[PDB]
Automatic annotation (TrEMBL), chain A:
Coiled coil, from the record: none
Range within the parent protein: 571 to 651 of 1302
Family designation: Belongs to the reoviridae RNA-directed RNA polymerase family.
Top-level division of the source organism's lineage: Viruses
Record protein name field: RNA-directed RNA polymerase
Signal peptide: none
Automatic annotation (TrEMBL), chain B:
Protein name: VP3
Residues represented out of the complete protein: 52 to 101 of 901
Name of the encoding gene: VP3
Subcellular location: Virion
Amino acid sequence: GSRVMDAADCFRNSADRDIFTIAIDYSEYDTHLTRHNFRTGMLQGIREAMAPYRDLRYEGYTLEQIIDFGYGEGRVANTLW
Amino acid sequence: TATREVDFTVPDVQKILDDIKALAAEQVYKIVKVPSISFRHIVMQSRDRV
């Protein structure tokens, strides 16, 4: 689409007498995304939501074994770049 | 036509089903020529009583 057309929700809220908007900004977002708290808590929710898919095996082995093949130790935790 | 034959092999039940088969090969008895020794004796310096 356009830019004026699909950003019309931004226009009408600066024309309203009773809307106070808050928009914060993260400076160097990855340096504080670097922390493990979003690393473990994401992988905790991946494993517990694959529990209805716990019977079927991906090419011999389970689905809970292959999620730590795309999020393992030598995959995203500690890799040389 | 000759595809997708691996549809329902659940490992929770297939593992307990391949062990019932291995329990059927459990031979209980044994076939021998002589029975085991059921009596033994000790000599005590004597030629009449043991």
